[PDB]
């Protein structure tokens, strides 16, 4: 429990400095390539750290689209493509020209 507190303090400082440095890079208040390259590394991690959450939550929360909506859009494209007479794309023939 002591370790976890300090890791969260290091964490908060680490992310909060990523935010501050990126506002400098957006505004143009910094012209040091190492600061930008550092900060991109931090933000890449902060993205993935949240993307791993998003991919896990999907399997936990299930399909965010209802089965109602999914069959609605599915049937809609069938009615479209049927009325367009769309012939579906075959697999590339063995001797295709």
């Amino acid at each position: 429990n002591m370790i976890l507190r300090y890791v969260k303090a290091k964490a908060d400082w680490w992310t909060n400095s990523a935010h501050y440095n990126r506002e400098r890079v957006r505004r143009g208040a910094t012209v040091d390539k190492t600061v930008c390259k550092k900060n991109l590394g931090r933000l890449t991690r902060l993205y993935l750290k949240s993307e791993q959450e998003r991919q896990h939550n999907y399997l936990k929360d299930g399909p965010y689209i209802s089965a109602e909506e999914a069959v609605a859009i599915y049937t809609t494209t069938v009615h479209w493509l049927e009325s367009r007479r769309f012939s579906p794309i075959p697999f590339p023939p063995l001797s295709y020209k």
Binding site: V78, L81, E82, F86, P88
Partner: peptide, 29 residues
């Protein structure tokens, strides 16, 4: 399991709905 193998091969490897044709029959699982 062979019952459901035969069942899902009627769901997977069919040609597309936009072609028409009769549905493959399925089994009650």
């Amino acid at each position: 399991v062979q019952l459901e193998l035969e069942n899902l091969m009627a769901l997977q490897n069919t040609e597309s709905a936009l072609k028409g044709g009769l549905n493959t029959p399925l089994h009650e699982s």
